[PDB]
Structure 1
Amino acid sequence: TTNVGDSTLADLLDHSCTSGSGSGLPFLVQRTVARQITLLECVGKGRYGEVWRGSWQGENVAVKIFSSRDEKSWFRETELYNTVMLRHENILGFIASDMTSSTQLWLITHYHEMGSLYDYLQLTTLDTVSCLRIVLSIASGLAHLHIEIFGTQGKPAIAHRDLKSKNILVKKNGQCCIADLGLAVMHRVGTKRYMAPEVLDETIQVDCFDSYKRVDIWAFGLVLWEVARRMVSNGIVEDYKPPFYDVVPNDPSFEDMRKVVCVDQQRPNIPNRWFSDPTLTSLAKLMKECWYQNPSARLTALRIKKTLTKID
């Protein structure tokens, strides 16, 4: 029940920047809000645990309740958001983390009722404007993760390491935001389907931060392909498929992927109908420059954002 002085989450999130004070609510407030949330309905579930829609004082929140198998993701995700000021409109907005009590680990964030891009693409087709808006916003979120910013207001470079359409949410305004920083590195292993060749054949230069950024870029190219399939041109559109759907089984093994990507050197196929639309011709070219076997040759996140901004 409401009293004079109460704040909404927007107010609580806003008065929260003294350098070192984190992306979410004030550190002592996180627990109190966590324990005042009513959980309502389960909206996702997987090897990571479950996401619930909850409410706090009349507002929707998402609560991720981690499975015991994936506690290190809770710790790392919570540490990243508490240590760093990571606030961007294309990165999922962190609110609070809490452990209860034989023990539940919670990460509470903004709730996106449209759900994941993965589900979004299965339930709808896209036009030029909405396709570009989706892939640009992902590019922007990812460029922001990758960029080091200095000063009292700043953040280190961050690589994600498990970019996939299931870890992208759709906002009501039709832009997306990247979620799930449980594997992120600052300057469990990735989902196998989206692993870059250097991860699959373990030649990744594991002490060069740029290696991890280039792993993100590979995955980002796969997501573009997923998204571009669903843009209609001349009445034609491809059915939603995940990357490598035709050459690896569901839940592919590390070995299945390595054979396809590294030994046989396969890449997702570019539909020929795309070459008669200028935006998909451009997205086609963007994709291919994310999929060089030489990780150094791949486009940066800032360049993709720049290139996508010009297609318009």
Structure 2
Amino acid sequence: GGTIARTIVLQESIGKGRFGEVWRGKWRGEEVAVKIFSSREERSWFREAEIYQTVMLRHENILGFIAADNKDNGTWTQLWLVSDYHEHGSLFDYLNRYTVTVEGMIKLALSTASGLAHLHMEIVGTQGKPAIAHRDLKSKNILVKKNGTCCIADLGLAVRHDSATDTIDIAPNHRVGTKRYMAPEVLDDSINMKHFESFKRADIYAMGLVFWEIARRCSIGGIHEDYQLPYYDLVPSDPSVEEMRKVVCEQKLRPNIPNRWQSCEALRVMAKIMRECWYANGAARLTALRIKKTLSQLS
């Protein structure tokens, strides 16, 4: 019989995501995480399985993928994505629960940037990995390991670049990601979707907003800021594209960078990075590689 879903016992409901219900389960004694999709969600299940099975994807800062599989309970069929299980949940959950040291902030920002750098990087060869842009990077799509480093997950909305023919592996649909985290050029539809670099640039804007989320919780001498999502001060919960666009593109606002942060060297390097991810012109933004180097030198 099958060697995956067949032998997995589900233990705890984690919650309903955009696509896929998440569960914590047990696989030959080991804790695993399982995304369950229904048969009418086959497209999203397949696409996410496809991305995670990209040659040479595995990296310690991308979620460790185990298998896609089917499970027939006798009444209906379930479509399964199985992965490593991370007890701390998302970077969102961790930043709400906890404050971090300077050491902790740098681990979270570095590991995240290393994950994105791996995604973005083309590796030549037959086993060579295609460049990949996430398209929905946000604190809820990044998980926190026990060792205090991040890994990027929820790769269902990702696009892959064929550098041989300069084509993207899907016919992309405008504005698929989380509205709050969409880059300006996404919010106003000026993004050139027939340029793969444009997708990598949108990811960098989103990562800047995530770094901001982290930096707020770095507690030095007792001083830290409460957890907020980006633009908590400017837009409602569940903001519309129009609400986001009026703030990010018309009023040209970005999350606030507190005075406190220029006191410390680490927060000053982080603050400089945020601003250099938040340019309205994607071309001027830092690359994930360049950000990885900087946080490596800082650490």
TM-score by structure 2 length? 0.91
In the alignment, residue 128 of structure 1 is paired with which amino acid?
V
**Which stretch of structure 1 is more off in the superposition, 220-229 or 251-260?**
251-260
Q: Tell me what 1:285 maps to.
A: 272
Distance 2:82 2:199 in 1: 26
CA RMSD of aligned residues (A): 1.6
Q: After superposition, what is the alpha-carbon deviation per residue over 1:115-170, rounded to whole angstroms, capped at 9, x for unaligned?
A: 11100001110001011011000000110000001224320000000000001100
1:39 pairs with 2:10: yes
Q: 2:22 aligns with which of 46, 51, 68?
A: 51
Unpaired runs of 5+ residues, structure 2, are: 162-174
Cα displacement (A) at 1:52: 0.5
Q: Tell me what 1:205 maps to.
A: 192
Distance 1:195 1:69 in 2: 27
Distance 1:43 1:192 in 2: 23
Identity, % of aligned positions:
68
Matches within 5 A, 1:83-232: 83-101=54-72, 102-187=76-161, 189-232=176-219
What is the count of residue pairs matched by the alignment? 283
2:231 and 2:255 in contact (8 A); partners too: yes
Q: 2:44 aligns with which of 73, 93, 112?
A: 73
In the alignment, residue 286 of structure 2 is paired with which amino acid?
L
Distance 1:268 1:180 in 2: 24
Distance 1:277 1:71 in 2: 49
In the alignment, residue 232 of structure 1 is paired with which amino acid?
S
* Structure 1 pair 300–252 and aligned structure 2 pair: CA distance change class (3 A): same
Q: After superposition, what is the alpha-carbon deviation per residue over 1:169-211, rounded to whole angstroms, capped at 9, x for unaligned?
A: 0000001100011001111810011000000000100010000
Cα displacement (A) at 1:32: 2.5
Unpaired runs of 5+ residues, structure 1, are: 1-28
* Structure 1 pair 69–201 and aligned structure 2 pair: CA distance change class (3 A): farther
Q: Tell me what 2:235 maps to.
A: 248
1:72 and 1:182 in contact (8 A); partners too: no
1:225 and 1:287 in contact (8 A); partners too: yes
Q: Tell me what 2:166 maps to.
A: none
In the alignment, residue 295 of structure 2 is paired with which amino acid?
L
Distance 2:211 2:78 in 1: 35
Q: Tell me what 1:10 maps to.
A: none
Distance 1:140 1:44 in 2: 28
Cα displacement (A) at 1:34: 1.8
Q: After superposition, what is the alpha-carbon deviation per residue over 1:258-311, rounded to whole angstroms, capped at 9, x for unaligned?
A: 111111111001011111111101100000000100110000010000111111
Q: Which runs of 4+ in 1 moved over 4 A?
A: 67-71
1:262 pairs with 2:236: no
Q: Tell me what 1:20 maps to.
A: none
Distance 2:54 2:221 in 1: 49
**Which stretch of structure 1 is more off in the superposition, 267-276 or 97-106?**
97-106
1:48 and 1:69 in contact (8 A); partners too: no
1:47 and 1:67 in contact (8 A); partners too: no
* Structure 1 pair 86–269 and aligned structure 2 pair: CA distance change class (3 A): same
**Local SS of the residue matching 2:249:** helix
**Local SS of the residue matching 1:35:** helix
Distance 1:68 1:266 in 2: 42
